[PDB]
Coordinates of N, CA, C and O and ligand atoms in Angstrom, one line a residue:
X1 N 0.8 -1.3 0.0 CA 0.0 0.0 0.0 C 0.8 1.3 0.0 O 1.9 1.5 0.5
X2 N 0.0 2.4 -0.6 CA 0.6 3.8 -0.7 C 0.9 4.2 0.6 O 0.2 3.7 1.5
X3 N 1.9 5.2 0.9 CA 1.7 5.9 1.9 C 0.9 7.6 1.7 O 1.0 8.3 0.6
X4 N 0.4 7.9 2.5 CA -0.3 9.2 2.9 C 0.5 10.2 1.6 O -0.3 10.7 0.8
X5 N 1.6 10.5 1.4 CA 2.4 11.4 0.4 C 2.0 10.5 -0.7 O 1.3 11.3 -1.4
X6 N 2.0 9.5 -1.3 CA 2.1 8.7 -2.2 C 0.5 9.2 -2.8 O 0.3 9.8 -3.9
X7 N -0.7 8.9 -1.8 CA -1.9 8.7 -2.1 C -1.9 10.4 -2.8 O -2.2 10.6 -4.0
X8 N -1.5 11.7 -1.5 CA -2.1 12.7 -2.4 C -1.0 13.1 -3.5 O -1.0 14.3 -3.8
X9 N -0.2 12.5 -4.1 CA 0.7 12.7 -5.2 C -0.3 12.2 -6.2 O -0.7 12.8 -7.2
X10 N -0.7 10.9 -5.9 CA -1.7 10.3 -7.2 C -2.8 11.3 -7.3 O -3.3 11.5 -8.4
X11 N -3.1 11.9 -6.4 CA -4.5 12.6 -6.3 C -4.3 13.7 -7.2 O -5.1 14.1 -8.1
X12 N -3.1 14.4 -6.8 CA -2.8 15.9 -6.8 C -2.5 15.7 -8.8 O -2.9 16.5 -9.6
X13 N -2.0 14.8 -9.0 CA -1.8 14.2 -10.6 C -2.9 13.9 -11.5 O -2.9 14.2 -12.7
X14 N -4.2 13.2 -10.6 CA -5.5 13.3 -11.4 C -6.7 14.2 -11.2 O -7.9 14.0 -11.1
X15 N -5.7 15.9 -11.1 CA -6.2 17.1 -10.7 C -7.6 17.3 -9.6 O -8.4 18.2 -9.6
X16 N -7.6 15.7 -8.6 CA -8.4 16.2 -7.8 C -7.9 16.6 -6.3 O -8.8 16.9 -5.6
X17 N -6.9 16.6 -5.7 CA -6.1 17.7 -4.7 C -5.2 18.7 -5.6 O -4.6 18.8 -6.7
X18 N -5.6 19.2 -4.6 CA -4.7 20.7 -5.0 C -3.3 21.0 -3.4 O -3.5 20.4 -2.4
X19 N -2.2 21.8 -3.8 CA -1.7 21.7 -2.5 C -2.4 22.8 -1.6 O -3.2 23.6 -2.0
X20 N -1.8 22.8 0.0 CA -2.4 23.6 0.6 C -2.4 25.5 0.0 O -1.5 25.8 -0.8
X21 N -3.4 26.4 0.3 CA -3.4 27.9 -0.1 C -1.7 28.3 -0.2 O -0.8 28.4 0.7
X22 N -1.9 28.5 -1.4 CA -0.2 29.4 -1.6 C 0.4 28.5 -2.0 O 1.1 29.1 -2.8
X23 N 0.7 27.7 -2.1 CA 1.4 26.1 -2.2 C 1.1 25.1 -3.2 O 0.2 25.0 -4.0
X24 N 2.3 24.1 -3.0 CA 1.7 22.7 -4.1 C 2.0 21.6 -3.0 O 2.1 20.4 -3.3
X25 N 2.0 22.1 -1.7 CA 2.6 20.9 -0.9 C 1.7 20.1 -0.1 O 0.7 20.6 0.5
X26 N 1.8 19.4 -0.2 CA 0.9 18.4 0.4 C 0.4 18.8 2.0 O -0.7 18.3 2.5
X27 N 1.0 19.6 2.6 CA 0.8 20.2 4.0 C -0.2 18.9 4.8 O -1.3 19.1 5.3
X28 N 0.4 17.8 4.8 CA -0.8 16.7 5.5 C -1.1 16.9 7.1 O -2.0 16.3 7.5
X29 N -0.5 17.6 7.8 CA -0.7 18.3 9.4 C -1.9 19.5 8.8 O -2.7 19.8 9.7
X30 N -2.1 20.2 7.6 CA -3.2 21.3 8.2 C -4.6 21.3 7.8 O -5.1 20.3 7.2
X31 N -4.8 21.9 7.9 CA -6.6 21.6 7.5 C -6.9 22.3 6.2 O -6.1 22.8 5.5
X32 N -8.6 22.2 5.9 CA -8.8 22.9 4.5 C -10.4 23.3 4.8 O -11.3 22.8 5.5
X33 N -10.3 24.2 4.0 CA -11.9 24.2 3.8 C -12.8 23.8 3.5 O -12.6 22.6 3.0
X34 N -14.1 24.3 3.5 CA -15.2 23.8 3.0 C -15.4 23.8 1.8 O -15.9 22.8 1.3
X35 N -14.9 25.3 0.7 CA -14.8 25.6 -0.2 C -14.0 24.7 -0.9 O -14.5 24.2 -1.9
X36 N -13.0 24.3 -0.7 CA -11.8 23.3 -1.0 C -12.0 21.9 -0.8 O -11.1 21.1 -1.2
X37 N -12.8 21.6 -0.5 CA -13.7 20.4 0.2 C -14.6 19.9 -1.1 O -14.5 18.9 -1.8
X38 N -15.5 21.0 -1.3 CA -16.6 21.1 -2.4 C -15.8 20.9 -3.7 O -16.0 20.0 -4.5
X39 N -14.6 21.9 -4.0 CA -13.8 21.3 -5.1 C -13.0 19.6 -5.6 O -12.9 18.8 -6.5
X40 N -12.7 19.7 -4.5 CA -12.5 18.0 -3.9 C -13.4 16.9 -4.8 O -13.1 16.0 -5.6
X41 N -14.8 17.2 -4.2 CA -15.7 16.4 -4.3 C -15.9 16.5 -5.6 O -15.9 15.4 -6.2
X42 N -15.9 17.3 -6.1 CA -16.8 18.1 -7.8 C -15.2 17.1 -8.3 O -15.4 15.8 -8.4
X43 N -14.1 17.4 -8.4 CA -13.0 16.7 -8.9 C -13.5 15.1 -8.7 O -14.1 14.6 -9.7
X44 N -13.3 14.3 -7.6 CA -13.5 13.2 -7.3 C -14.7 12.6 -8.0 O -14.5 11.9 -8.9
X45 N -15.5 12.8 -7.7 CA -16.7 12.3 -8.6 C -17.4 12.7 -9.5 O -18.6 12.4 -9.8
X46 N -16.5 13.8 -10.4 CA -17.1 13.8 -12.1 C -18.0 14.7 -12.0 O -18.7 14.5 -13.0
X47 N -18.5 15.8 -11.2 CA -19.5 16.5 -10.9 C -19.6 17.5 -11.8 O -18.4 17.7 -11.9
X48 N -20.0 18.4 -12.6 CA -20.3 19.7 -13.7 C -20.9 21.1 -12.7 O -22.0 21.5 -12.3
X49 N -19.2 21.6 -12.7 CA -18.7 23.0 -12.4 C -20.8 23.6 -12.7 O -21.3 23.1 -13.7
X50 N -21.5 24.3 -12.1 CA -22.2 25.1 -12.0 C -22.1 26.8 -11.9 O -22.0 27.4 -10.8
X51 N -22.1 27.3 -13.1 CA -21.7 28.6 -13.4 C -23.1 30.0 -13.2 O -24.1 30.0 -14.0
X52 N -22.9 31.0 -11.9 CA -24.2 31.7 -12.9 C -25.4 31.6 -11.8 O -26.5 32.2 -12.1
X53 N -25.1 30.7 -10.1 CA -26.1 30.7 -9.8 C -25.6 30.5 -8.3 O -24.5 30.0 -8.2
X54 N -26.5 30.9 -7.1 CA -25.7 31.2 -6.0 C -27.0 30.9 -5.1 O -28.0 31.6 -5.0
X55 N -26.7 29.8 -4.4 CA -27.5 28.9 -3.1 C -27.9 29.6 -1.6 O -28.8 29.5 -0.8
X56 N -26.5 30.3 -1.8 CA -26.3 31.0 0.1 C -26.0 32.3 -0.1 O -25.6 33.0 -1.0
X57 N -26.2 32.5 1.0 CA -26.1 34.3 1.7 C -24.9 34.5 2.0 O -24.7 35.7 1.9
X58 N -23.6 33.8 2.3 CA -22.6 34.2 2.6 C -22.1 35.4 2.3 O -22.5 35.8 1.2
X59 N -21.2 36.3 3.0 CA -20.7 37.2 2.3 C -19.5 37.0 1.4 O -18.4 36.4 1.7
X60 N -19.9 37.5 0.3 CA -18.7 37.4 -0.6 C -19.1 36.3 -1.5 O -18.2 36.0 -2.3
X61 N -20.3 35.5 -1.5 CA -20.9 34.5 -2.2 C -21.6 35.0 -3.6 O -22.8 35.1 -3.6
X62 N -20.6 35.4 -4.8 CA -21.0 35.8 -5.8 C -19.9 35.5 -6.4 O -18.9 34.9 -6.1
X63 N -20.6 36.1 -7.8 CA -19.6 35.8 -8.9 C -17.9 35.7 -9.0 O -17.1 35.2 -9.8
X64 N -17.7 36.4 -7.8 CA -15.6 36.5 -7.5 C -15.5 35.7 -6.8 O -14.9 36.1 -5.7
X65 N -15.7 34.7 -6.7 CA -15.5 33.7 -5.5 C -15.7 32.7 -6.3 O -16.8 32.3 -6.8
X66 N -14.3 32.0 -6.5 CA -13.9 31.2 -7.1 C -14.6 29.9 -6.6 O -15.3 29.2 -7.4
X67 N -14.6 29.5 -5.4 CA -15.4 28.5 -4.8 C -17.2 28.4 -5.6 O -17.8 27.3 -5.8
X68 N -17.6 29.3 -5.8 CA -19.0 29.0 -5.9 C -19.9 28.0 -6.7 O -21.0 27.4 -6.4
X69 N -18.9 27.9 -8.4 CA -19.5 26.7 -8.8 C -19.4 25.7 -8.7 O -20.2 25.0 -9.4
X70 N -18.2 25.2 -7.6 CA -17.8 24.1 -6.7 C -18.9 23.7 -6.2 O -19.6 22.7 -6.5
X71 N -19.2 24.9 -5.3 CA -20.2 24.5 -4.2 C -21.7 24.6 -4.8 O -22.3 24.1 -3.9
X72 N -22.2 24.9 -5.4 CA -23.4 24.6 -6.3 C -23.5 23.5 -6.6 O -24.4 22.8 -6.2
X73 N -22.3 22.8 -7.4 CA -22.6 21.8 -7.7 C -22.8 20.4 -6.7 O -23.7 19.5 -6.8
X74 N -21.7 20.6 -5.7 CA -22.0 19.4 -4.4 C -23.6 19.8 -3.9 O -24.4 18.9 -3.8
X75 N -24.0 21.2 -3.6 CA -25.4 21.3 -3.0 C -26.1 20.6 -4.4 O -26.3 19.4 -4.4
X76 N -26.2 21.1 -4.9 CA -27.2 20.2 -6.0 C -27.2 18.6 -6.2 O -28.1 17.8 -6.6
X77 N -25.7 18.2 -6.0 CA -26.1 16.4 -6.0 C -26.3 15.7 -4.7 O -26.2 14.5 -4.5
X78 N -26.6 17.0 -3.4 CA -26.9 16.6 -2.3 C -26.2 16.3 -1.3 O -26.6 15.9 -0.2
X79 N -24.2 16.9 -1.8 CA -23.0 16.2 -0.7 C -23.1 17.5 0.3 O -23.0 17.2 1.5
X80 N -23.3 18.8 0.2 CA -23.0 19.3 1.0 C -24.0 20.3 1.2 O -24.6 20.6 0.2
X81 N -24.5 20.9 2.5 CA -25.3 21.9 2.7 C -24.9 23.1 3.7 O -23.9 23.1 4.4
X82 N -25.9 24.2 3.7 CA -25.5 25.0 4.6 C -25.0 24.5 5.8 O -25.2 23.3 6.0
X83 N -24.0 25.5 7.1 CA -23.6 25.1 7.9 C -25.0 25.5 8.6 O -25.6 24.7 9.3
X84 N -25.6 27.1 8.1 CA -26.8 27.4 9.2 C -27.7 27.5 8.3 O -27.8 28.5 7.5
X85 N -28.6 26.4 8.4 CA -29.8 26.7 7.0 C -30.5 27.4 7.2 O -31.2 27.6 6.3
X86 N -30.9 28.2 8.8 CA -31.8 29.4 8.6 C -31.0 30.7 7.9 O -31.4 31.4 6.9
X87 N -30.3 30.8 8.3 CA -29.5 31.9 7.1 C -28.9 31.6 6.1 O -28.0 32.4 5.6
X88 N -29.0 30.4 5.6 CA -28.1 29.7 4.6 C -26.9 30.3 3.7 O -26.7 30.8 2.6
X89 N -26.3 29.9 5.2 CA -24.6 30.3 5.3 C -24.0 28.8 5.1 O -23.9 28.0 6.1
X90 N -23.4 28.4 3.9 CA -22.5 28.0 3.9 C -21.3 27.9 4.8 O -21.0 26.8 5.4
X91 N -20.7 28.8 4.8 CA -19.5 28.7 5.3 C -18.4 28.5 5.3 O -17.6 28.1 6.1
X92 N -18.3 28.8 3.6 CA -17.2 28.4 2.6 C -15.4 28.3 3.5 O -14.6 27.4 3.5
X93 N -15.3 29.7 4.2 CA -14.1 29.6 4.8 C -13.7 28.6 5.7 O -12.6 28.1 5.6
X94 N -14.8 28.4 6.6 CA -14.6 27.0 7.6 C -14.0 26.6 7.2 O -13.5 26.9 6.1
X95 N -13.8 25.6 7.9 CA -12.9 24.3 8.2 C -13.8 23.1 7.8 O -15.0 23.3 8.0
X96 N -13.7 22.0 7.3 CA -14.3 20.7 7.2 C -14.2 19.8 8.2 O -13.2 19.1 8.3
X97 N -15.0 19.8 8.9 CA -14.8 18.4 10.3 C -14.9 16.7 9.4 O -15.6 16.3 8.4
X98 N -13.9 16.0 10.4 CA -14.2 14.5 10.0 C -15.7 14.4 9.8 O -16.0 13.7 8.8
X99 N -17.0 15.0 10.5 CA -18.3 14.2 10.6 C -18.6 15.1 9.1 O -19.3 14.6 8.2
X100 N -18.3 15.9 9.0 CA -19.0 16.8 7.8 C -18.5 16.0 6.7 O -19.5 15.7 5.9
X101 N -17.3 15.5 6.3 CA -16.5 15.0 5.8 C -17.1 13.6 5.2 O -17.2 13.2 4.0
X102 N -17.3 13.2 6.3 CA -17.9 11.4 6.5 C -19.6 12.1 5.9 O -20.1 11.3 5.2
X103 N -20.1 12.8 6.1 CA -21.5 12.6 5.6 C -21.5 13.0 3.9 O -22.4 12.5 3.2
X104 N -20.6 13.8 3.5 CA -20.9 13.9 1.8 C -20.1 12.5 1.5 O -20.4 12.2 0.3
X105 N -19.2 11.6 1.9 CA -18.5 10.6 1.0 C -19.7 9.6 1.4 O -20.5 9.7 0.5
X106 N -20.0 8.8 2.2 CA -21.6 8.0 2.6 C -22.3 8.3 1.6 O -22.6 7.4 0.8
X107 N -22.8 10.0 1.6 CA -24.1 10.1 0.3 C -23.2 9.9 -0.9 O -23.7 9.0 -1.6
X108 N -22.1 10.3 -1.4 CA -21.7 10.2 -2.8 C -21.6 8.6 -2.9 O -22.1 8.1 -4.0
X109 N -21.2 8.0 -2.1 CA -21.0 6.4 -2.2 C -22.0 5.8 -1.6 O -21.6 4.9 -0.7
X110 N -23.2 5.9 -1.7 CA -25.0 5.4 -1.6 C -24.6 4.1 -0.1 O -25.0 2.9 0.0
X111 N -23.7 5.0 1.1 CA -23.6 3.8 2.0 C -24.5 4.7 2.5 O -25.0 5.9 2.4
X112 N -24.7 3.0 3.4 CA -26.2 3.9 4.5 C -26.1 4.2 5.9 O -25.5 3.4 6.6
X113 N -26.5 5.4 6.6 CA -26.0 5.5 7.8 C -26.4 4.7 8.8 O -27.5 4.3 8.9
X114 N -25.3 4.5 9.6 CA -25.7 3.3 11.0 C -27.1 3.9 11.6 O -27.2 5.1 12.1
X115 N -28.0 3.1 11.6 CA -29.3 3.3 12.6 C -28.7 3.0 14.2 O -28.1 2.0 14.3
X116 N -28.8 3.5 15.2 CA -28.1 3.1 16.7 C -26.7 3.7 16.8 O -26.1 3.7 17.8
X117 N -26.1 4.3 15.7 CA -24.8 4.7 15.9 C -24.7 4.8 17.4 O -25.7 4.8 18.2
X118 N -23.6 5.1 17.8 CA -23.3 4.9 19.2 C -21.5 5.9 18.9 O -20.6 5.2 18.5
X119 N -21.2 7.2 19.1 CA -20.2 7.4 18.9 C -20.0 8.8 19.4 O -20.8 9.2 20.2
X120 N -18.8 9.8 18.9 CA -18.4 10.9 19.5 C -18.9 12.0 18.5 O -18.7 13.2 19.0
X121 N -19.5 12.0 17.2 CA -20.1 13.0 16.1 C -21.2 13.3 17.1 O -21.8 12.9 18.1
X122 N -21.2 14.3 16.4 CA -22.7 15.5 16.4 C -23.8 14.6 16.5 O -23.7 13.6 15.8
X123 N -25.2 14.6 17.4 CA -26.1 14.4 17.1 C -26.3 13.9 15.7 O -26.2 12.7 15.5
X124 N -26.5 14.7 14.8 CA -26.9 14.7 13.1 C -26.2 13.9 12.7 O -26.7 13.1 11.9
X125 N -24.9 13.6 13.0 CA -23.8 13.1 12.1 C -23.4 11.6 12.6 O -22.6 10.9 11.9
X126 N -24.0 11.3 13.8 CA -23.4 10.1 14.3 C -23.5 8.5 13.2 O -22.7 7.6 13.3
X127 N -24.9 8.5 12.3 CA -24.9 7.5 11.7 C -24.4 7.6 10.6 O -24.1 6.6 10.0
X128 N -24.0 8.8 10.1 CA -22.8 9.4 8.9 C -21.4 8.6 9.2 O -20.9 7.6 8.6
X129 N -21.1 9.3 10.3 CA -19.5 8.9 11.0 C -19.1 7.6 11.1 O -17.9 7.2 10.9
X130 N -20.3 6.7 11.7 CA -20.7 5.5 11.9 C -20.1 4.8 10.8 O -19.1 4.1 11.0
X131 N -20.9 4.9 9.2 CA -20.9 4.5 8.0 C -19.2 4.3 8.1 O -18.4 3.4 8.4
X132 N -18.8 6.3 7.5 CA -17.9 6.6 7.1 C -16.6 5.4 7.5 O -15.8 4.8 6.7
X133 N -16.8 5.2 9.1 CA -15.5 4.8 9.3 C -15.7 2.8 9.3 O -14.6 2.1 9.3
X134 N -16.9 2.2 9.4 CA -17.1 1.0 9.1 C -17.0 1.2 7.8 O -16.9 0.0 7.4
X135 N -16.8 2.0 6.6 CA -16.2 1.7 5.2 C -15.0 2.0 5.3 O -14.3 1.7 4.3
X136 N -14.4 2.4 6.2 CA -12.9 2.2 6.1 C -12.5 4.0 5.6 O -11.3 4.4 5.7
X137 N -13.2 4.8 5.4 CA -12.6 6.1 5.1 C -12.7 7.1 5.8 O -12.9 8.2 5.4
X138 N -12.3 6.6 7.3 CA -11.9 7.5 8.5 C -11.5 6.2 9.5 O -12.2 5.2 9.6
X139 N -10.2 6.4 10.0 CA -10.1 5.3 11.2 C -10.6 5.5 12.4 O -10.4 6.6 13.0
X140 N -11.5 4.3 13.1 CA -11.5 4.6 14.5 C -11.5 5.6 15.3 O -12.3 6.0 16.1
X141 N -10.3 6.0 15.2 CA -9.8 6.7 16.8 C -10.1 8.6 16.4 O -10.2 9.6 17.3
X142 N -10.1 8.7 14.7 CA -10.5 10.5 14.4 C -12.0 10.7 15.3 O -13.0 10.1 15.7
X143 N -11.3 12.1 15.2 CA -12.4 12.5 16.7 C -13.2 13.1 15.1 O -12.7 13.3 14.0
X144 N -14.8 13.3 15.6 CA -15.5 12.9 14.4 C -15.6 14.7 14.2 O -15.9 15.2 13.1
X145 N -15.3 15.5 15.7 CA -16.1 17.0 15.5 C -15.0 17.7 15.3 O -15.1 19.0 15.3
X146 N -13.4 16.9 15.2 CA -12.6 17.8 14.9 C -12.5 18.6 13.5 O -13.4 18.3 12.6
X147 N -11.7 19.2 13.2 CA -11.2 19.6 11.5 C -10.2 18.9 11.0 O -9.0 18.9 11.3
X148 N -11.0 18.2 9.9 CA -10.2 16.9 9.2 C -8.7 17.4 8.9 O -8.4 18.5 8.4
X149 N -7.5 16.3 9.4 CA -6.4 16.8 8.7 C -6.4 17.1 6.9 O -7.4 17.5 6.2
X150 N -5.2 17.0 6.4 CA -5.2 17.2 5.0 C -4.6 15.4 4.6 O -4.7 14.8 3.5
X151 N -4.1 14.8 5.9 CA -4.1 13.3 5.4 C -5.0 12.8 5.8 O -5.2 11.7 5.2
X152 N -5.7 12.9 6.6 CA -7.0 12.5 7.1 C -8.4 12.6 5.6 O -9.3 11.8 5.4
X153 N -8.0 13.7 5.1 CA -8.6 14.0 3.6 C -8.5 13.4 2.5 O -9.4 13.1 1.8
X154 N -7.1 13.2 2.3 CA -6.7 12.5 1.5 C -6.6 10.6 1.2 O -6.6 10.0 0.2
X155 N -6.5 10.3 2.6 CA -7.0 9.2 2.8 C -8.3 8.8 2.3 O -8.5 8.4 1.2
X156 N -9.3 9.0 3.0 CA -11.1 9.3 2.6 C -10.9 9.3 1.2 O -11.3 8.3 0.6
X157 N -10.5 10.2 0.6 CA -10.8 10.8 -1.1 C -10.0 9.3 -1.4 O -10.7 8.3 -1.3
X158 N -9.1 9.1 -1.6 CA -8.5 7.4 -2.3 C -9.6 6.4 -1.4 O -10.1 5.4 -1.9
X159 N -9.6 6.6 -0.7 CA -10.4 5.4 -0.5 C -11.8 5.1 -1.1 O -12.2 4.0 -1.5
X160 N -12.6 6.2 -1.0 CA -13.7 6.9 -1.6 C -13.6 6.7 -3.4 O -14.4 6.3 -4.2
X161 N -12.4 7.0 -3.5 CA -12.1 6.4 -5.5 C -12.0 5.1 -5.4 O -12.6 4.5 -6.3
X162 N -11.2 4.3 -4.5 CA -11.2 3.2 -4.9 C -12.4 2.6 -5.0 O -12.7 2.2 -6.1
X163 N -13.7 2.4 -3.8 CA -14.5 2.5 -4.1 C -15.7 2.7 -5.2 O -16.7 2.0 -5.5
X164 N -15.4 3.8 -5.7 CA -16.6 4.7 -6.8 C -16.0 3.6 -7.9 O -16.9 2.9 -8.4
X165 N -14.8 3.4 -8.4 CA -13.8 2.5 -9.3 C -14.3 1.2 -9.1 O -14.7 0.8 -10.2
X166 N -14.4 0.4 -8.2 CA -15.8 -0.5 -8.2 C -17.1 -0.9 -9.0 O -17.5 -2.1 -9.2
X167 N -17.5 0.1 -9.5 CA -18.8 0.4 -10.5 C -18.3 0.5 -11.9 O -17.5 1.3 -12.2
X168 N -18.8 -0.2 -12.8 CA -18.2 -0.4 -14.1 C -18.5 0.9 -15.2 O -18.0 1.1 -16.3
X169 N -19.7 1.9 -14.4 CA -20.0 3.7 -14.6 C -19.0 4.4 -14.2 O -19.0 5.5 -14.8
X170 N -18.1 4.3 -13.4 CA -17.2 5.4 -12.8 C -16.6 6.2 -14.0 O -16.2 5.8 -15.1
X171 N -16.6 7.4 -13.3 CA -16.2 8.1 -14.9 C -14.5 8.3 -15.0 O -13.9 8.7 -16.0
Ligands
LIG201 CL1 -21.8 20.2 4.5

């Protein structure tokens, strides 16, 4: 098996990581966004860039903000949603937690969340987390409400392809 550098080298080569802001380095100790997250996903699973149309209130959630047809497009195939849906604030800057993390790879990969979960996620997120890490694309011991490393990311995303690669559709 790959190691953690090895995985996001593959990744970073089939243009779905990018290196940390400013960077091409793999920075696997820091974290990433939500924005960066939604690109991730739209990369990873074949998703069509949405130009032209804008979901949330955020500030700064228009046309200059590179992030937005990212994130259009994951809201629209259902991976990601507001952080606060009464003001439907995204929250593009955030940070991505393991549980947030684990709930769009579950929906992208039609696993189903544990009923009875029993664990350290969010309320919302416990039968997400559950899934996530009984598929193998979070270990055990990640605290589920932290902010996913960038190997902790990158892990999930290969594992999550190897997976999707599975299906004789994978694009
Ligand atoms: Cl989300």
């Amino acid at each position: 098996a790959k190691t953690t550098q090895e995985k996001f080298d593959a990744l970073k080569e089939a243009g779905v990581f990018s290196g940390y802001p400013g960077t091409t380095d793999a920075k696997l100790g820091q974290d990433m966004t939500r924005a960066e997250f939604a690109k991730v996903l739209v990369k990873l699973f074949g998703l069509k860039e949405i130009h032209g149309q804008y979901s949330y209130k955020d500030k700064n959630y228009d046309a200059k903000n590179w992030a937005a047809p990212f994130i259009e497009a994951v809201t629209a195939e259902g991976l990601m949603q507001a952080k606060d849906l009464t003001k439907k604030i995204f929250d593009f800057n955030g940070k991505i937690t393991v549980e947030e993390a684990s709930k769009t790879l579950v929906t992208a990969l039609k696993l189903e969340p544990v009923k009875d979960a029993q664990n350290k996620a969010t309320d919302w997120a416990k039968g997400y987390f559950e899934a996530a890490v009984n598929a193998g694309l979070f270990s055990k011991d990640a605290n589920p409400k932290a902010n996913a490393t960038r190997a902790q990311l990158v892990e999930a995303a290969f594992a999550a392809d190897e997976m999707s690669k599975g299906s004789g559709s994978h694009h």
